[PDB]
């Protein structure tokens, strides 16, 4: 439909990320969330009849837990980067793997909210 | 007196397991023997271990395995041939034969992720360290990178210990570098003269957006054809889509190293649906060159330099195909596999290597002998067609000429070739032959094989022989020895053979017997044969995608890919965009290159048979020394003529 | 990158040997994307056009693509901090388009340009951010500073040799440009 | 329906194996190993019980080549085949026994003939080689100067020809052209003739069975 997509965009425009963190990290995290938790979800949501009702409580839960998982990713990127220097792109790329893996598993688990 | 025979590879390799088959004929009881190796000249006592006793129960058979140590004395001289002495003490009998020693001690394979690198970009290459048996080994590797003018820029000294034969290395090209054909060269510490190399070029490139392949209908141009050369342009997007643009084609004659262009062959063919064609009238080709003669063009070549432009005027790709021959005959005949020595009064094998003019092997093309043309055969998938000619028992040399007999072509187009084979020569003209007729098809590991031993001797001496001795070469060293019994009266004996995965790619089989003939003079008759095996991995590694659904994955979307390989092995991976392969597809690595290198590094270069027993053993890559005094020839050159 | 990937696998078995896999092909294709085609290197303070291609490989559906060039302080295009450079183009199905832009580089180093596309009546976007290398105007030229033969016994006497290498003036060298200097040593092989 | 309950995961058939062997020459064994339901098994190592060093793997057609070294004796010869596939016990492997009779000539003159053929998934067009193994003493060897071979496809004389053989050769090779008209099988029948004993005409013949891809 169209109203559902507007609601999903309104939910995904409430995500607040620090500007103080590194620009390349911020771009990588935003790109990951956009390509693994917005594009498939928007594609799924767009194919609904207008009369169908959409839940939002666990979508807000999704937003809370994606905040916390991005916080943990930043934690691994900042100081838990033992393999290379802190704030280096090498361990950012290293942690991108499990970041994206966790995100896709999250989406596979949460695909059950979209219909009540 | 019983004769003692020692068989060793004709060329020895430093730091490797080299076998020395010990066999005794007519031996009585247990005969202990200790084998010792001494430097030549002098006596440095390099190795004298691995002694073994003989047992009549095991048919007086035994092989000793050791490794020649690598010392500074061998490495002191690198510009001249060096030899060592192997000596065996068969109880109270002593036998010793000199043998050449080479410096090759393995192979180096260099893999680079890309083939073109822009200045200011990293270089990632891996050095593969393997031995003569193609196994991981721990050695020391020197790595050097040379600019096109020939100046080393970066040198290293790595060790393959604890790395399981894989050495990952990196280098950073300076932002300001002379472009050209850069080279990476590596060599083992023990043999600095042996240099392995790869080639990657630095270019001021940007990745294209599509691939252009020019495929002529036939990989040649018949000189008398009236239509002329036809070339088809097939422009396809990299991600599996068709192109709608325009193309330019120019045909040039490539003679030697000088390229001559044809201004009048330029055409603007509009490529549609990712396909297109353009003609070249024979008149243009004839008039373009100065000489209007026809036969002078034979031996030259053409090349197509196609340029493709999209309708949007965005990107241009230059695709060039060169090496299309100009030959009056659509087929070629090669005798690189046919044995050069037959056996009088005995079936003779004629492996003909029928190939396309460019070099690729042909397929399903009839061949026949000029005389008694009823014999015909078709080339298999490997471009080899079996033949069989009955040979009269005459000492005169026989001349064989073969000519393809494909229909719908005249007598002028068929390719011809002439070959002269010399008869096998015995000792004392005793007329004692041995032949080994074997299947030569697209053999694979596991499938069985049937060697046919064909003895030929007079009835007065058909009882003394009671067995056979056969050896199997592979990659320069022995693989398996054994005795095939033969009770008296059985003219034909068949030897079942198990072709495992270790016989890749081409094992050379020899066979010989011995007896007393003439008036009490010991003698030996030998034979050899060349057999091909399918070129494939010794293991089996396959890469396939686990996700069977969700066709054409979106960028940023994960997939899972399986790696089906042998347990306990180490796997290295690299992902390469096909754009760089569009802009450069040479100097890669593949299984074919590896097997070509291994085959080139062989020790013998005569596909079976020979002038005589000593010649047969010398060509097969073995030296054979007897206690009585029978011996092979002498080899002192690393590369055969 | 919207392209096809080739994966080459090499094994190393302690018992079997060495194997090289056949190449594996995966085609990463999307129904709508942008392929920014750029010259590898441009020259500072000289106008060069750029081309953005808006592919469209859907079914017979039509797309009203909107493409814009976000302002970058390192380039001089029509996009500023306040004003915006927007176009509203239409892509016929199974076809292509090319939107030209004019860009004038300002500062050397390694700058980046990017375009963003949003589809109307649907919700799908794709932006491409590539980096084009900028080099100040000039060419390559290599004069030899000095060449000399090392022979302490023959030159300088007393078994020693002191050689003075005067630095090149390089009065024509471009300002704010690095310049390498490769030092080569080669002996004199005499034999026989 | 038809899933069997058999203690042995393999079966062995001797329908393609010749029932008569020439003493003193390689008697070929066409072991036909099949799955319990009836489908031809593939890639199982068959072997002879004696001299276990001899073994082979079946081709894609469910038949495996074999080769034995028959002794020059007139006694009956017995062969038993026992598969030796690994990771199975000694009871699971299938076993089969067979007793072959020796070829009998006329006058007990030992005038034999053998004819060995390549046995694989043959295709039309691909050439073939047959080996003619004569066996006679050199006193009467010079009399024979030719061979006669016949080809039978679908029970008719497909091609008859004479293969010449010069004296002194213990064997000859006859190239064969397998066209598309040889499908699905043919039987070479080679014989010669000469005066033998003390004035009695003698004839010795032979035959072989060859499969062609269907
Ligand atoms: C050559 O040396 C090898 C060394 O192993 C011999 O291989 C052994 O052969 C015996 C029986 O032939 C087997 O029982 C052993 O298991 C083999 N060894 C290994 C490690 O597998 C080989 O037999 C020797 N060649 C000859 C002709 O005896
Ligand atoms: C300067 O560079 C050129 C390549 O542009 C090359 O010939 C060489 O390195 C230098 N020229 C001369 C004449 O030495
Ligand atoms: C008869 O035999 C000859 C032998 O060459 C053969 O060519 C021919 O096809 C056979 N059939 C007839 C009818 O002649």
Author numbering:
A (entry chain D): 1 to 116
B (entry chain A): 1 to 641
C (entry chain B): 776 to 967
D (entry chain G): 322 to 535
The article reads:
Albicin is a potent inhibitor of the alternative pathway of complement from the saliva of the malaria transmitting mosquito, Anopheles albimanus. Three distinct pathways of complement activation, the classical (CP), lectin (LP) and alternative (AP), are initiated by different sets of effector molecules but converge at the point of the proteolytic C3 convertase (C3bBb) of the alternative pathway which cleaves the scaffold protein C3 to form C3b.and anaphylatoxin C3a1. Here we describe the cryo-EM structure of albicin bound to C3bBb, the alternative C3 convertase, a proteolytic complex that is responsible for cleavage of C3 and amplification of the complement response. Albicin is shown to induce dimerization of C3bBb, in a manner similar to the bacterial inhibitor SCIN, to form an inactive complex unable to bind the substrate C3.
In the reconstruction of 3D class 3, density covering two molecules of FBb was observed after refinement applying C1 symmetry, allowing the structure to be further refined with C2 symmetry enforced. The von Willebrand factor A (vWA) domain of FBb shares an extensive binding interface with albicin and its secondary structural elements are well defined along with the side chains of bulky and buried amino acids. Density for the SP domain is much weaker, making it difficult to visualize side chain and main chain details. The C-terminal end of the C345C domain of the C3b α-chain, which normally interacts with a magnesium ion at the vWA MIDAS, is also disordered making it difficult to verify that the MIDAS contains bound magnesium and if the C3b α-chain is associated with the metal. Localized refinement was performed on the remaining volume containing the core regions of C3b, albicin and the vWA domains of FBb from monomers A and B, resulting in a map having a local resolution of 3.4–4.0 Å at the albicin-C3b interfaces and 3.9–4.5 Å at the albicin-vWA interface which includes 558 Å2 of buried albicin surface and 530 Å2 of FB surface. The albicin portion of the FBb binding interface is made up of the C-terminal end of α3, loop α3-α4 and loop α1-α2. The vWA portion of the interface contains, α6, the α6-βF loop, βF, α7 and the vWA-SP linker. The α1-α2 loop of albicin lies adjacent to α6 and βFof vWA while the α3-α4 loop of albicin interacts with residues at the apex of the α6- βF loop of the vWA domain and α3 interacts with α7 and the SP linker. In the region where albicin interacts with FBb, Asp 19, at the apex of the α1-α2 loop, forms potential electrostatic interactions with Gln 411 and Lys 429 in the vWA domain of FBb. When the two complexes are compared, albicin is found to extend further along the surface of the MG6 domain of C3b than does SCIN, thereby causing FBb to tilt away from the C3b surface relative to the SCIN structure.
